[PDB]
Design a binder for this molecule. Structure first.
Ligand SMILES: [Ca+2]
Ligand SMILES: [Ca+2]
Ligand SMILES: [Ca+2]
Ligand SMILES: [Ca+2]
Ligand SMILES: [Ca+2]
Ligand SMILES: [Ca+2]
Ligand SMILES: [Ca+2]
Ligand SMILES: [Ca+2]
Lengths: 360, 5, 360
């Protein structure tokens, strides 16, 4: 196995395949075949594959080398470096200028494969749309819930919409985007690690994203990268059941103003429970906080509100999380009563909605 | 804290 | 106690006095003679900041939780006016329609450092002290039972001030003339004090006044006064650590040498980080290997005309030196395979670094 490639062609691919990819799981699989270098990393649950065209003379073969070391060596080389590589003995030799490195290898035959599977559902969409779907909901995923499926993200197709849903039982996020293709009705749960990877592979170019879903796997193609992940089994909660049936008390406020008011009040909230009280009245919101040390915060804001007066408690971090995710100009809070959840949305868009359950 | 489901 | 002050006139002071039992988490606030004073301490060292009161005010003192009070002030909008008044056991903070009530502890219970006499004094530019500390700070020890190493020597001799720092393995020294006849003297400033001193220096045009006592040191810059205990111990003599008259001198580009070491270090031993240098006529070769028998080699052009020799050392220590220097060219002053190496910016003898030899 021999290749010679410019540093600038290896770097992004090495970076993409290298996170996080027992010993052999810390190696990358390198394969030279049919004018292409393929680089593969896996953790057994998921897999990233990059392809690199070889325009310089090369020779076929495969090996496996430590991922961090190989990436750190390539990255440490100077701008415009050419990186010549050849297998030799039980070692892989890397040359550039008068820098020489000899890396240990494990057999390509030892490198694990994900089981083969069949695509059942397929669609294409813009990078920016997938970025939008994930960033809108990611923060509402559970971290280490005993209900494992809540630790991932639901991806749902309905009509011509792709939808993400994330929830931890206390708060929920849902975002739906049109993708201009007739889809089957279908839902899968992607583990949190897969969501992180799916997000990482979106470079922000004009390269579209091609998705393939099997019964137990999901695959995303963008540019010369193919990411595959196993799915999570379980009964993900239905966001339709969670959205308030009729939250006809409508409050609108400036997002930055509302956020910074909650942020200040939060300073004097209980350090563990983080409770704040909202008092809504005619075109006014009062936010209060206090803690066991009898310290007290009070914020008063002008808002648009015509409905009946009410009082309601929330974990302030949940509210702040929504506002930070929204990045809006104006926000609408849609209320029911003191003991029911609140729906929160950007006043200008209904593409995303957030539901937060109150505290007593 | 109350729950959604 | 009562004062009204602009947000920004409190933040820098609050930042400074936060640096250093419950009351140690509070800041002493004192209104007196048109001035608000803020003091933070950890019992070993103390920081006092003074801010001019141009608005009406009433004298008095209290103590307030530092982090909560800082966070509230920082959380208020740019340019906000912050009105503060005592009210029972609480300190009332008000700005716009934001109101806060913070717990207090009596000013009487706020601890004072012991009183002491200044025995040696000098003024120097802030930039000079920053240079001295920054040049050597990284070589101090952490929590070593040789307590006198967890600090930095400050030495006066003739017309220059010198800092020395060492962890018992590598050494840094920096000497700068300050245009004043000084007594021959030295003291050890504890490492936390060194860092607090460092951060008090705002890169501005205020001169720094240093006062050294038998067991204390004080630094005055503009509106800030830092005071710290000294470490009551004996520091090692840097003169005996510097290699005595090294007869071989190698010059190289600083970035090129650093990048070559950084690449070679990847295949060095993770625990001991030993790398070898082979010096020949205008050429340096750096090698590294590890227990897995992986190997790196770097060859680069340098300025050298001495006898051929080899030497090993800890690459992490040498990388630390090169990152501290941020130079154009570096001077490496060599003796032989069994002696230390002295490294300096080629364009200045003010700072020097000593790294031990390794037999590899
Ligand atoms: Ca082969
Ligand atoms: Ca080699
Ligand atoms: Ca489960
Ligand atoms: Ca929706
Ligand atoms: Ca509260
Ligand atoms: Ca302003
Ligand atoms: Ca005192
Ligand atoms: Ca002296």
């Amino acid at each position: 196995m021999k290749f010679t490639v410019e540093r600038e062609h290896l770097l992004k691919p090495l970076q993409q395949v290298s996170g996080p990819l027992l010993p052999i799981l810390g190696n990358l699989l390198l394969q030279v075949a049919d004018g292409t270098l393929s680089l593969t990393g896996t953790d057994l649950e998921m897999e990233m594959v990059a392809r690199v065209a070889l325009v310089q003379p090369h020779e076929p073969g495969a090996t496996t080398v430590p991922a961090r070391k190989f990436f750190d060596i390539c990255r440490g080389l100077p701008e415009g470096a050419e990186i010549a590589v050849q297998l030799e003995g039980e070692r892989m030799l890397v040359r550039s200028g008068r820098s020489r490195f000899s890396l240990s290898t494990l057999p390509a035959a030892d490198f694990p494969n994900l089981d083969d599977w069949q695509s059942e559902v397929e669609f294409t969409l813009p990078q920016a749309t997938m970025k939008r779907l994930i960033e809108a909901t990611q923060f509402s995923m559970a971290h280490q819930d005993v209900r494992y499926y809540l630790n991932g993200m639901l991806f749902e197709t309905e009509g011509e919409e792709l939808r993400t849903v994330a929830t931890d039982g206390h708060r929920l996020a849902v975002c739906s985007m049109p993708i201009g293709q007739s889809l089957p009705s279908h839902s899968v749960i992607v583990p949190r690690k897969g969501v992180i990877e799916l997000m990482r592979m979106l470079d922000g170019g004009d390269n579209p994203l091609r998705v393939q879903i099997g019964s137990n796997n999901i695959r995303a193609h963008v540019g010369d990268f193919i990411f595959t992940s196993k799915l999570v089994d379980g009964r993900f909660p239905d966001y339709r059941r969670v959205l308030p049936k009729n939250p006809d008390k409508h409050l609108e406020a400036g997002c930055d103003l509302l956020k910074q008011a909650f942020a200040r009040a939060a300073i004097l909230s209980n350090e563990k429970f983080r409770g704040v009280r909202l008092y809504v009245s005619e075109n006014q919101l009062k936010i209060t906080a206090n803690n066991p040390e009898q310290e007290e915060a009070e914020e008063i804001l002008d808002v648009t509100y015509s409905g009946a007066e009410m009082e309601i408690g929330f974990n302030v971090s949940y509210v702040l999380d929504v506002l930070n995710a929204l990045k809006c100009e104006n926000v609408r809070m849609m209320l029911t009563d003191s003991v029911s959840s609140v729906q929160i949305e950007d006043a200008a868009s209904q593409s995303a909605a957030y539901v937060v359950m109150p505290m007593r | 804290q109350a729950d959604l489901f």
